[PDB]
Design a protein around this nucleic acid. Structure first.
Ligand SMILES: Nc1nc2c(ncn2[C@@H]2O[C@H](COP(=O)(O)OP(=O)(O)NP(=O)(O)O)[C@@H](O)[C@H]2O)c(=O)[nH]1
Lengths: 122, 44, 119, 267, 54
RNA sequence: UCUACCCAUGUCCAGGGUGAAGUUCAGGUAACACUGAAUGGAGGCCCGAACCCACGCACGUUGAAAAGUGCGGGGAUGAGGU
RNA sequence: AUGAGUAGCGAAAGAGGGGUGAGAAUCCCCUCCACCGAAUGCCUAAGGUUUCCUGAGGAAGGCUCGUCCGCUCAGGGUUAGU
RNA sequence: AAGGAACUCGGCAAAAUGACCCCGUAACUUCGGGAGAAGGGGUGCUCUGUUAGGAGAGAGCCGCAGUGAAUAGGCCCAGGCGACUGUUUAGCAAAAACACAGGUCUCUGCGAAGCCGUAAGGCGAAGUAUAGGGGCUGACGCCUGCGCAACGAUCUGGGCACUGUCUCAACGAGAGACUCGGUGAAAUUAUAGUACCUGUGAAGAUGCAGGUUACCCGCGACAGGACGGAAGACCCCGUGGAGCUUUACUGCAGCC
RNA sequence: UGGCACCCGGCUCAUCGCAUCCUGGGGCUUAGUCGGUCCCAAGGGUUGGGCUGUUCGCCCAUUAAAGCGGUACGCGAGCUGGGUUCAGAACGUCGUGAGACAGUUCGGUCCCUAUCCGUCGCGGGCGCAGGAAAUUUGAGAGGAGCUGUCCUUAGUACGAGAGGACCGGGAUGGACGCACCGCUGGUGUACCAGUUGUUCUGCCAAGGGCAUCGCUGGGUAGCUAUGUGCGGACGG
RNA sequence: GAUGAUCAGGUUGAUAGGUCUGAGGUGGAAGUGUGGCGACACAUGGAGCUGACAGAUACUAAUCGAUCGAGGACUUAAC
C-alpha cells in the first residue's frame, strides 16, 4: 500500500536509486496504490553524473510490495521490499535492465517489455 | 504549605503576656479597658 | 465468558484458589450466589484430577491447592484428603458433584447468599 | 526549482509604492560578484522618474578588475555606480557628495523658492542577504539595525534619522515571483539570498565545481590538501572521512561563501 | 446548568408515578415453616417445601 | 509564630568521575620554561540519591487540597538548606 | 420547600470456619493470602492536656452498620543524690 | 497490518538512547577545554583450572532474544542575546530582566564625608586616602565598533533515530457511569396546565394574530434555545477621590 | 479664518437559495475532431501538499469539476489565542514636565452534576363495543440518486488529405453505502511454551507469589478493516 | 442486552454446568533408562496441557404455588 511520502527503490540501471512519491494517479480521491499501478515521484538519490538527476519529477510502475496481491485461485504473493521502475508515458523501460524478481500481474496490464526484460517472474 | 500560625508557648508569653503589657503605658491602658468591659480573661 | 467478580485477574485467581481449598476441608460453605456459581467449575475439575490418581495428576493439583491442615489428628493436608477419601466416595458417579442451595439476602448490603456443598 | 516568495515580500512592494512620494533619492544595492543577475526588474518597473545610484557591496570578496570593468559598464550605460565595502568603510565617504550633486537642482530651486535647505531622504532597496542594514549601521555609527548571516532578517521597513542630514528608509529584500533563467537562480542560490532549505544543494555544488574547473583550474588544483581534476565529483568529496555519501556537498558550499578560496567573480 | 424555575407539586407527583416497590413472591410454608420465598428455604428451619436444610 | 533583611549560637549533604598548584626523577641544558614518569587532591568543577526549587504536559476546578497530584526537569561543598 | 431519592460516601486485597449477641460483610479468636520495610520500623522534640488502663452503654459523633471506638458514664494510673 | 511528520503555529505529546568493559575521536579555542564528541566490538552456561596466582586464553552447549525482569545520557549542524555560577513578580510572566568579577567619575585629613534621630546617643570604625560614601558602565582579546572558546529548562531555523501525531481508526485492562441494599447535599427558583412556521412588536416571541401538527407517564444519551448560571472580560461620566509635573500661588526645611 | 461628499482564522457536524463548476436536454455561432455564446434545469458530486501573516500571495501535482452565496465568524453550557488582548522586558518616533503612538519583537489562568422546550434510542398505562394467538393491506414518512476509461460499431459520418465523430451494445475502475468473518491481517489479562532476580512448599528434582500480564515467541471463540459479497441498472 | 424489553427452555427435557469423545492452539509433559567429565542430547510418545467452538449422556440445578383474564350496550334496514 504505497501512498504519499513513501520511499521506494528503483530496480533499473538509470542512475536513480531512491524516489519519493508525490501523487497517485487514477481517481478523484485515490490514496493507495498496489502492484501494477502508476505513480508520479521525485528522485531523491542519484549519481552526480548520469541519465537522470536529483530533484527531477518522473513516473514509475510498482513491481514489488510488502503486501502483495490476492490472486483469483486464492494464492497470495508477497515480497520483502517496495520497488518501482521508471517509465515513459508510452509504457516502456527508461533504463536497459530490470533487477530482481517481478510480479506476474504486470503482464495483464500490457507491460510486456518490462516482463520480457525481467530475469525471473513469479 | 506552612500556615501562618505555628504555636509556641514562650513567644506567646513574651509578647502578649501580663508582664509585657504592664511594662509600658499602652499595655496598662489595654488592661484598664479590658477590666472595664469585664472580660473573664485578660492579657495571655 | 467468565464472570469478573469486580477484581483484577491475580486477585480473582487468589479467591478461587482460596475457596476451592476451603470447600474441600469443610465440605459445605456459605457465600454469595454469583460467587458460588462461578466456583462449581473448578471444584469438579479438581475432583476429576483426584479420580485420575497418577503422579502426574497429583503434581497438577499441587499448583491449585493451598497448604492447610484439614484433619488434625492424623495430620493429613488438603491434597491428601482430596486424593484419599474423596476420589473413593465419587467412584461411579460421573458428572456433577456439587449442589447450589439458595437462601435470602443479608442485612449489610442485600446481597443474595447461597450454600454450596458436596453431593 | 527555486520559487521562494513569502508574503512579506508581497507587502513590501505595496508599502514602497504607498510611500514613494516622500523619497528624494534611491540607493539600489547590487552584489559585486554577480552585478547583472542581482538586479531586480520587478522592483525597477515600479521605480521610475527618480534618480538613483548603483552600489556594489561586498566588494572585498570579488576580483578587482572585473568589478572595475562592470563599474565602467554601468557608468557609460547611463547610470552612476560605485564600489563599496560595508564592513570597513572604503567608499562610504564619497556618497553624500554624490547625493548632493544629484539633488542640487531641486535644492537650489527650493532655496530660490524661499525656504531653508532640509535633510536628504534616501531609500535603500535590493535583494536579501546584501549589506542593506550593515551599510546603514556604518553610516549612522549607532548599530541600530538588526543583522544576521542568513537571508530574511528584517521584516518591516523603518526610518532612521542620521543627524540633521539624512533620513534613510530600510526595506526587507525582494525577489521576483517567478524565475526565468536557471543560471541566474543558481548564481543567486550560490551567493546566498535564499533560505537554502527550499532548494537542491547538490545542483548548486555541481554548478560551483564545473564553474571552478572552467575558470580557476589552479584554484581547484590547490583546493584543500588534494591535487586532482577528474571527471566526476566523488573524487574530491571523499578526501577526509559509513561516511557522508553526498552530504559533503554542504562542505563544498560551506567554505566558498566564507572565501576559503581566493577572491573570484561570476559576472 | 441550573434549574430555570421551580417545579410545582403536580409535576413532582406525576414524576414519582413509577417510583414504587413490588409485592414479593409468596409460596407455601415448608415443613410448617413461616411462608417462605419461592425457590428458597423456610424461615423456620431452612426447609424446601418440607425439605429442611441448614 | 507567615514572609523581607540582619545578629549570636547548633546542625545536614548516599555514591561515582575529572585531575590545578606544589614535590621527586629527569630528554634539554651549563640549569631552565618546556617532555614524559611518579606523588599530590584544588574547584561559586561534572553525573547523580536524601534535601531545596518550580521549566513542560495532563488531571482536578460546588476539587483529597481557598495553589495539590502523576510523569519528565534545575541545584546538589556552596553568593548552600535548616 | 424545588433541584432529588440526583451528585457524593475522601488513593490501597482479602477468603473461609468458630464465638458473643434481640439483631453481625464491619466486633473478638483461628488458618491461609496480600502491602511497606532509607519505612507504612523504634525513640523523643515543638505542640496537645486525660485522649492512657479496667468495668458498664447503645440518645447524639463515627460520610453505611455496629454487640466496637481517640464517643458517654464510673473507678484507677505518672515514685530520681547519678 | 502498510506508510513514517503526510498532523500542526511549532515533532506539543508519545516513541527511541541509557549498565559494565575494549578500540576510536573533528572544526574551533581565552590552550583549561570541546569530549561520555561522532562512530565500532563483547556480555549466557560447562570444562580446561588451588586457572597464572582469581584470570586470560582455549575448547564446547542451548534460545527468536544472553547488563534476557526493575532502575541508569537521544545525537549532529547555523544564526541572534547574555561572558560564566547565581536572583526575581508567595498564587499567570524565570527571561534578553536584577546582581556579578573588572573599568571609570566625584566627595572625604579624622569629632572625616555621608546617613538614623528634636536632642542626648549611634552606624561609618575602633577603620585613616592601597581607606570609606555617592553616580555611570559591566568578563578578556582586537577599535573608542569588531571577536560566541565555555556555559543556557533562552529565542530562531535545519538533519538523523523513532514512532497512533494521522491516512483511518480497531481491540484489551482498571476507576466512574448503569442495577440493587444503607446514608444522603448544592448553585437556581414571580405563578405556570410550558409545540412548530411565516408575520407583528423599543427593533432577536413556549405566552400576540393566522395556519399546520400533537393519546397519558417515565428511563438512558446530545448540547440548538430560555439574550442560560456565577464571578463586567469595558466606552463615557462623575464641576467623586488618590497620585504626578510646574515660568500657579503661599507656608517651613536646610544652607549663605 | 480654504473648498463641499458622505451618517477572526482552523476542527466536528450540517441545512438552504440559484445568480450553474461538472454531469442531462437544446437553440445556435460551429467541417468532425472541436471550441465560443445564449436559453431549461438544484438530483448528486465538487482535492492533497511546499513556502507563507495565505494577501490585497506565490508555486507543485491531480480530477468529469476543483461554483457563488445565506444561516448572530452557521457552529465556545461542542474543541482550539491559533489573530485580537492585560500586569515583566528591550529597542524606537513625537514631546518644554507630568506623556503620546503602537512601529517592531520575547513570555503570559475562567469554569458549569441539564430544570423546561428541543433532537437520538428504550419501556410502562389505557383506548379501539366479547375475550385471545398469529398473518397482514397500505393512508403517510424516510433512504438511495455520482461519474471515468477500454473493446466493438468501423477510421465506418466526414475531411482532397492530414486528421476524426458517435450513443446503440460489452467489459472494467474511482469515491460512497449496506452486510459478514470462509480467506489475508489486528486485538484477544482464567490458552500453550522460553527466560532474569528474589522469596516460599524441610533438601535434589518438580512447582507457587511479586517484579507494566515481570519480559519475550505464538494464538481459539468474540469484536473487527486495511479483507470479502452486493448496490445505485433500467423501465412506465 | 445500561435497566426494562426480545428470544431459547422449565423434568414427555438437552436451557446451563459437569462427564465422555472430537475440532482448533501450542510444540515433544512428569517419571524412568541410555551417551557424555559437565552444560546437555536421545527413547518411551504428533507426547502433555487446553477459557468462550461442536456431538453424545439427566450426574447437579430449572419444586412448589401465586396473580390476572369473557358471557358480548343502543337504533334503523335486509331473516
Ligand atoms: N564581507 C562582507 N560581508 C558583508 C558586507 N555587507 C554585509 N555583509 C554581511 O552580510 C550580513 C548582514 O547582511 P544584511 O545587511 O543584514 O542583509 P539584509 O539585506 O539586510 N537581509 P534582510 O533585509 O532580510 O534583513 C553579515 O553577515 C555581514 O557580515 C560586505 O561589504 N562585506
Amino acid at each position: 500500500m504505497i501512498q504519499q511520502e513513501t520511499r521506494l527503490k528503483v530496480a533499473d540501471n538509470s542512475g536513480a536509486r531512491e524516489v519519493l512519491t508525490i501523487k497517485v494517479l487514477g481517481g478523484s480521491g485515490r490514496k493507495t496504490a498496489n502492484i501494477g499501478d502508476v505513480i508520479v515521484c521525485t528522485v531523491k538519490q542519484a549519481t552526480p553524473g548520469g541519465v537522470v538527476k536529483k530533484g527531477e519529477v518522473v513516473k514509475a510502475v510498482i513491481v514489488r510490495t510488502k503486501s502483495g496481491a490476492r490472486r483469483s485461485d486464492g494464492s497470495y504473493i508477497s515480497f520483502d521490499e517496495n520497488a518501482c521502475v521508471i517509465i515513459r508515458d508510452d509504457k516502456s523501460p527508461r533504463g536497459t535492465r530490470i533487477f530482481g524478481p517481478v510480479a506476474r500481474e504486470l503482464r495483464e496490464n500490457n507491460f510486456m517489455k518490462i516482463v520480457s526484460l525481467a530475469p525471473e517472474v513469479i | 504549605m506552612k500556615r501562618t500560625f505555628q504555636p509556641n508557648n514562650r513567644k506567646r508569653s513574651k509578647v502578649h503576656g501580663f508582664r509585657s503589657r504592664m511594662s509600658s503605658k499602652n499595655g496598662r491602658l489595654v488592661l484598664a479597658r479590658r477590666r472595664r468591659k469585664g472580660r473573664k480573661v485578660l492579657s495571655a | 465468558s467468565y464472570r469478573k467478580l469486580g477484581r483484577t485477574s491475580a486477585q480473582r485467581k487468589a479467591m478461587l484458589r482460596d475457596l476451592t481449598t476451603d470447600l474441600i476441608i469443610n465440605e459445605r460453605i456459605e457465600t454469595t450466589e454469583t460467587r458460588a456459581k462461578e466456583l462449581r467449575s473448578v471444584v469438579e475439575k479438581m475432583i476429576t484430577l483426584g479420580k485420575r490418581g497418577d503422579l502426574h495428576a497429583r503434581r497438577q493439583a499441587a499448583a491449585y491447592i493451598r497448604n492447610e491442615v484439614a484433619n488434625e489428628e492424623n495430620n493429613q493436608d488438603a491434597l491428601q484428603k482430596l486424593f484419599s477419601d474423596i476420589a473413593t466416595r465419587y467412584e461411579e458417579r460421573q458428572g456433577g458433584y456439587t449442589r447450589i442451595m439458595k437462601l435470602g439476602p443479608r442485612r449489610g448490603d442485600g446481597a443474595p447468599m447461597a450454600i454450596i456443598e458436596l453431593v | 526549482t527555486i520559487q521562494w516568495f513569502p508574503g512579506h515580500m508581497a507587502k513590501a512592494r505595496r508599502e514602497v509604492t504607498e510611500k514613494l512620494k516622500l523619497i528624494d533619492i534611491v540607493y539600489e544595492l547590487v552584489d559585486a560578484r554577480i552585478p547583472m543577475s542581482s538586479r531586480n526588474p520587478m522592483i525597477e518597473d515600479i521605480l521610475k522618474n527618480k534618480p538613483r545610484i548603483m552600489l556594489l557591496n561586498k566588494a572585498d570578496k570579488a576580483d578587482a578588475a572585473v568589478t572595475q570593468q562592470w563599474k565602467e559598464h554601468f557608468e557609460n550605460q547611463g547610470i552612476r555606480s560605485l564600489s563599496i565595502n560595508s564592513v570597513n568603510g572604503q567608499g562610504l565617504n564619497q556618497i553624500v557628495p554624490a547625493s548632493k550633486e544629484i539633488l542640487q537642482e531641486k535644492f537650489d530651486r527650493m532655496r530660490a523658492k524661499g525656504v531653508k535647505p532640509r535633510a536628504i531622504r534616501a531609500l535603500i532597496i535590493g535583494i536579501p542577504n546584501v549589506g542593506k542594514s550593515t551599510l546603514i549601521n556604518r553610516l549612522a555609527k549607532k548599530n541600530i539595525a538588526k543583522t544576521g548571516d542568513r537571508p530574511g532578517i528584517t521584516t518591516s521597513q523603518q526610518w532612521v534619522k542620521v543627524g540633521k542630514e539624512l533620513e534613510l528608509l530600510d526595506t526587507p529584500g525582494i525577489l521576483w515571483p517567478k524565475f526565468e533563467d536557471e543560471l541566474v537562480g543558481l548564481r543567486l542560490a550560490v551567493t546566498g539570498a535564499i533560505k537554502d532549505s527550499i532548494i537542491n544543494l547538490q545542483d548548486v555544488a555541481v554548478f560551483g565545481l564545473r564553474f571552478l574547473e572552467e575558470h580557476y583550474p589552479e584554484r581547484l588544483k590547490e583546493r584543500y590538501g588534494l591535487d586532482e581534476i577528474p571527471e566526476d565529483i566523488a573524487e574530491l568529496f571523499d578526501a577526509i572521512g559509513l561516511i557522508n555519501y553526498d552530504k559533503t556537498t554542504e562542505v563544498i558550499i560551506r567554505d566558498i561563501r566564507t572565501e576559503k578560496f581566493g577572491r573570484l567573480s561570476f559576472e | 446548568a441550573v434549574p430555570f424555575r421551580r417545579t410545582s407539586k403536580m409535576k413532582k407527583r406525576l414524576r414519582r408515578t413509577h417510583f414504587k416497590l413490588n409485592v414479593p413472591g409468596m409460596t407455601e410454608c415448608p415443613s410448617c415453616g413461616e411462608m417462605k420465598l419461592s425457590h428458597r428455604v423456610c424461615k423456620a428451619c431452612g426447609s424446601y417445601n418440607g425439605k429442611d436444610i441448614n
